Amino acid sequence: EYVQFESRSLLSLFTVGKIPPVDAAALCYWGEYDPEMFDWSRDYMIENIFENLPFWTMIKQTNWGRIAIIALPRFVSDLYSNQDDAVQVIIEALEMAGIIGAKFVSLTGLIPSATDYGLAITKAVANREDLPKITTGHRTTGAAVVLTIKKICEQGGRDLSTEKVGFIGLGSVGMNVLPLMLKCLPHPQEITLCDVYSKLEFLENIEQNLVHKFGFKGKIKLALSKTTVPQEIYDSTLIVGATNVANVLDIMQVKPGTLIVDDSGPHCFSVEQAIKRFQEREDILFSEGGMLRSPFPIKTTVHLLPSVEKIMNNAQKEAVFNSNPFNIMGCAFSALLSSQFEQLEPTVGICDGEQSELHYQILQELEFEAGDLHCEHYVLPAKSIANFRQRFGK
């Protein structure tokens, strides 16, 4: 009903006037390359499967405008391995996005992390006026994570003021979330800051700002990761993830009663292990952190890459047809917010991010909340959440 498959090219349908222009776009990529998961080399897949071209695969029609979802013809490791090439393929996708009407384009996933948070792109297109404006969307993502912290505490039957909160990954998203959480939600009793060893001095400065600028009066701890998080992180009762490295947290070692909000993509813990533990014990709550729930249903048009349409053609793989029609990622929705509300300026670079409050406030005014607790394909059943709340609430 709210999800429709389109076998014909969206680009073709647009150029003949059969579908209207969009107001915004969001750029994504084709996950990660693993030679043991595909029949072909990385170069073969880029040239012959992705055709070295951006691919317009989805339209999300919201109450606040239409967003095109456009996949770059790259894997995430390609973006990190040659920034010049990443910027060039992004500029190619921006030209397509402008033709189909986008005024603002969000850089989803790890594209900001790989492109100096967009600054490498804006420098390369400074001599052009024919392209949409770019945004990392991280202020909206930060607002979505804070909404999810609020939601997961409510669903768990606990107040944030009694939690010991562990932040795993204090990069662009993580440092949007932490100040906004302190500004908008009750302060927890303890905060642990966890990142890699080379960022010790960076974390020490955050600790100073926590005391003197954000007004945090609780206990502050620093925890340095090597290949995985240190064991002290498992003393936390609420874990907030935003890493660029998968599987650094062992979900089987979190204590019963722990709440986990994770914006990392791929997740900083094993999704399959989390689902298994939850189904067997119902003693954690865990969720994506970046997903918003719109008050109005969203109409999604899906055009699969004809390769994927045939191989990933399980009749049950049409879980797309049944994905929640109220959900939209905050990063992608940020491009619509910047076009609806001029004060929500696009973000490029590491930004001061106190304007994250403006994103949180406008989402609250529009009656957005965090998406219902879920992790990738798996929705946590409401009765199982109630069982957790009965046992581990306060």
The site for ligand NAD (CB under 6 A) is made up of 108-110, 112-113, 138, 141, 168-174, 194-196, 199, 225, 229, 242-245, 248, 263-265, 290, 329, 331
Between residue 45 and residue 64, which ones bind its own copies under the rule CB under 8 A?
Answer: 51-54
Of 92-100, 240-248, 273-281, 384-392, which part binds its own copies (CB under 8 A)? 92-100
DSSP-derived 3-state class of residue 219: strand
Please state the closest distance from residue 130 (CB atom) to its own copies, in A. 10
The DSSP annotation for 245-263 comes to SSS-S-GGGSPTTEEEEE-
Q: Which residues pair with 267 in a beta bridge?
A: none
If the CB atoms of residues 114 and 153 are measured against ligand NAD, the closer one turns out to be 114
Q: Is 243 annotated as a binding residue?
A: yes
If the CB atoms of residues 45 and 292 are measured against ligand NAD, the closer one turns out to be 292
Q: Is 98 annotated as a binding residue?
A: no
Q: Is 154 exposed, middle or buried (0-12, 13-18, 19+ CB in 10 A)?
A: middle
Q: Are 107 and 76 in contact (CB under 8 A)?
A: no
DSSP-derived 3-state class of residue 98: helix
CB atoms within 10 A of CB 92: 15
The item of ligand NAD, its own copies, none sharing an interface with residue 96, based on CB under 5 to 8 Å by kind, is its own copies
Query: CA-to-CA distance for 348 and 117, rounded, in angstroms?
Result: 6
Tell whether residue 96 is a contact of its own copies (CB under 8 A).
yes
Do the strands 219-225 and 190-196 form a parallel or antiparallel pair, or are they unpaired? parallel
Please state the closest distance from residue 103 (CB atom) to its own copies, in A. 17
The item of its own copies, ligand NAD, none sharing an interface with residue 95, based on CB under 5 to 8 Å by kind, is its own copies
What H or E segment, with its residue span, contains residue 107? strand 104-107
Please state the closest distance from residue 250 (CB atom) to ligand NAD, in A. 11
Which of residues 61, 92, 325, 378 is near its own copies by CB under 8 A?
A: 92
Tell whether residue 124 is a contact of its own copies (CB under 8 A).
no
Tell whether residue 17 is a contact of its own copies (CB under 8 A).
yes
Tell whether residue 15 is a contact of its own copies (CB under 8 A).
yes
Tell whether residue 26 is a contact of its own copies (CB under 8 A).
no
Structure-token match 């890699």, residue found: 196
Largest CA distance in the chain: 61
Q: Are 101 and 61 in contact (CB under 8 A)?
A: no
Phi, psi of 335 (to 5 degrees): -65, -35
Do the strands 374-375 and 133-135 form a parallel or antiparallel pair, or are they unpaired? unpaired
If the CB atoms of residues 282 and 369 are measured against ligand NAD, the closer one turns out to be 369
If the CB atoms of residues 123 and 213 are measured against its own copies, the closer one turns out to be 123
Residues making up the annotated binding site are: 109, 113, 117, 172-173, 195, 199, 225, 227, 243-244, 263, 265
Residues that bind its own copies (CB under 8 A): 7-9, 11-13, 15-18, 51-54, 92-93, 95-96, 99-100
